[PDB]
Amino acid sequence: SHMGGEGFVVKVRGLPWSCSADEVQRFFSDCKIQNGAQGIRFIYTREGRPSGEAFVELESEDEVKLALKKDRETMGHRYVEVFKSNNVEMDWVLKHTGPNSPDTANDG
Numbered sequence: 540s541h542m543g544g545e546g547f548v549v550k551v552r553g554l555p556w557s558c559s560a561d562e563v564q565r566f567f568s569d570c571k572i573q574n575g576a577q578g579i580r581f582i583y584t585r586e587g588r589p590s591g592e593a594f595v596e597l598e599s600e601d602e603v604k605l606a607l608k609k610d611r612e613t614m615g616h617r618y619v620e621v622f623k624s625n626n627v628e629m630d631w632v633l634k635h636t637g638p639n640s641p642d643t644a645n646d647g
Contacts, residue, residue, distance in 0.1 A: 543640065544625025547573060549606040551593040552622070554581070555615030563593055566614045570606045571598040580629075582636050590636060594629040 543550055551563060560576040572578045578596030581589035597603050603623055610621035632638065 542623050543628040544623070545600075546623065546625035546627070546629065547597050547600060547603060548594050548624035548626060548629040549597065549603055550622035550624045550629075551595055551619060552591070553614065553617045553619040554589070554591050554593055555617065556589060556591060558615050560593075562615065563595060566612070566619065567595055567597075567606055567609070569609065570595075570602045572596065572602075573598050580633050582632060584636055594624055594633065596629075 549567075551566070554563060560579040560581075563579050564572055564576055573596035579593055581593040583589050595606065597606060606621050607623060610619070612619055628640070631641075
């Protein structure tokens with residue numbers, strides 16, 4: 540079990556290097572993607588090339604779950620992992636390519 544955070548974004552992992560936002564949008568055809576292809580952002584490195592990962596925004600948390608039910612399916616050639624991403628996580632991993640979560644639970 541893995542969650543990035545409570546957000547209207549999902550995390551799309553296992554995408555081919557040869558795909559654009561069109562193919563990823565077509566993958567989430569059963570999901571209402573926020574702002575269309577502008578809601579989709581591949582995690583591009585300093586090398587100007589995608590990690591094979593993206594963040595897709597969605598209109599509703601229900602739509603996020605419809606994205607999560609397709610977590611397994613083969614896109615391009617490979618199996619795709621669909622996680623649940625927060626607006627905070629999505630923004631930070633696009634600016635700073637790092638799957639390391641801001642783990643802070645000062646509890647007692």
